[PDB]
Amino acid sequence: DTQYILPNDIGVSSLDSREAFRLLSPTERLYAYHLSRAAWYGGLAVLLQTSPEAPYIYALLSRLFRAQDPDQLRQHALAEGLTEEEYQAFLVYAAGVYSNMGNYKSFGDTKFVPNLPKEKLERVILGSEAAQQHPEEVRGLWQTCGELMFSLEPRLRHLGLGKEGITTYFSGNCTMEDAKLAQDFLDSQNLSAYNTRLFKEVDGCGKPYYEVRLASVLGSEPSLDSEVTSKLKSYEFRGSPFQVTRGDYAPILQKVVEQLEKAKAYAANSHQGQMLAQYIESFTQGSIEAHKRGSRFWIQDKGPIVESYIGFIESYRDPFGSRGEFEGFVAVVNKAMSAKFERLVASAEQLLKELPWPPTFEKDKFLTPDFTSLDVLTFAGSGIPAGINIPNYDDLRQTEGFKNVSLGNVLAVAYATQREKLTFLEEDDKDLYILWKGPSFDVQVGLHALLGHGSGKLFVQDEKGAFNFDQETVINPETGEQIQSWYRCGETWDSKFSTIASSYEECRAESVGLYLSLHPQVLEIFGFEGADAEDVIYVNWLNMVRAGLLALEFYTPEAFNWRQAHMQARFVILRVLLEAGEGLVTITPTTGSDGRPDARVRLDRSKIRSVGKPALERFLRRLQVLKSTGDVAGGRALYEGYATVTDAPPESFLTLRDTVLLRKESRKLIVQPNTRLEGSDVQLLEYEASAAGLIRSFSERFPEDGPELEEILTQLATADARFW
Ligand SMILES: [Mg+2]
Ligand SMILES: [Zn+2]
């Protein structure tokens, strides 16, 4: 029962962005203001992309804390018979639903419910101030999402397709087969899935009618553009009728383009103004092509003061793994920290040569990638990462280039751990861990994006029998014969690997990071060159091994399914270094000070280069070979081979899993600042590092459209209620 529950004393931290914001000029602040607003508007779309009840839950809480702040509500809640412990349980839950934009954890895809009796919360909500101003709206909301807010039925606990899970990227009656069928339909029409959803309905006959709905401001009405309009029709695909519609998240996206236009007025240069014009095109029409062209302009704007990106980008939470979750961020460049990353780019092309795979599997042309350290002012969406490689359009990654980003002030929050909190470690390891995990993470994050995601060439064939590579000269180094597999027209990385695409690529990126972290030159770029360099390496690997063990929390044993892509990647890497044997990694079941079941992680420092590196190189070379040729069947057999969780000796993971769950530590919530505009001045509003502080950060997040946004999210959820 500890699962599906956010602990009262869950950690909360705020972002250090006060100083970064002060550096900006009066115009750049107006540029960052509207971009941030656009992001937060679009962030609400995640509610519709999470759970059926998430829009209702957000709207219900947004009405509560609008009338009564967390301290005003406290007096009311305690007067109704709730203990202070039970009230804090509600604040944490609300702060949870806010920081994830849904009642499911973005990192774990797990449902969480309030930690208090259902009837006690009913008394608080139905007896509140917002319930006496708009009783019709409040009581309605409570009768709609009341049971679902607390219901922990097995089918509701996790995100997923079929009867066994919950997802709003699809309808309730959808299964994996419907997703694969729809995917082939999209590849054949050359229509991207990044901003689409799939709905399978049935007529009075029982014959399933599939509907693909693109996300856009404009609806069924005709517009000027025809690149999307000429696709809005009915189809006949393998005996199954397909309909391509749009207008998804229309009122929300309408608010988004409003702020994108206003931001274009304060645009720095021409590229920033053209990319926003295309983003407006993509959100108004529903054109990923418009987004692709906008992203193309975005890569051209190198070293900007106010970096930004927005749209349906990442596909982690899509059960099939091709549909994008809406996000967007505004950040100020940290020219101080970014000095360490541009020297890495200076020798980046060099480091790509010492990678395990032959130079025929690397991008033929190496464009200089823009790598900058950023201080985040705003990151809308489900959660916040440490670093990002963008865009995810593979054709752009080998044409115009790409941008690497390390979030400076986000790493600052992560750089916080107590000695007793560190689990599955020996006492002598704890010291080196605390001392070096900070610098070691910068090492990993840098290689993860630049030389990890930023490397690798995909084999593509055009309409004619011509390839972007010489067919007669390229040899598969794992087979011996020439290449017999490639990406056809319209096929992308995600469309072919689907349900493991996200995990597979991060694992390839993670392994690259570990691999190239052994290079004394790379460490010199950050500045270590010595025994301190040796320690960073040991920590970078010990962290990886320990993460692999901790990853067992995000595995569901009954469905044989991984819920988090990055953690599945590290468990794979963990098993790769256990397959290598030679006493490199050992996991031993022990007993802690409290007497509860425990475990220990031991890693041999001297055998990292003699046993670890060659084992990782073999694994690293196989990954890229199967990615470039696009060999799914083999790619799956390899990755899902090491991603298999069984309690086979000597590790016995299923038994260790309970130990991990028993002693697990929830990740901390993050409070983000706000920007307010009075006359011509742009001020920065900061908040408390608390649950109540986080709630206040959202109550003042929409000053104008408070009541209106709650109205939009409500009716948008009401229309599609039939699907679930
Ligand atoms: Mg389902
Ligand atoms: Zn990554």
Numbering used by the authors: 3 to 726
Paper lines:
Crystal structures have so far been determined for DPP III from humans as well as from Saccharomyces cerevisiae.
We also determined the structure of the unbound enzyme in the closed conformation. As a serendipitous result of the co-crystallization trials we also determined the structure of the unbound enzyme in the closed conformation.
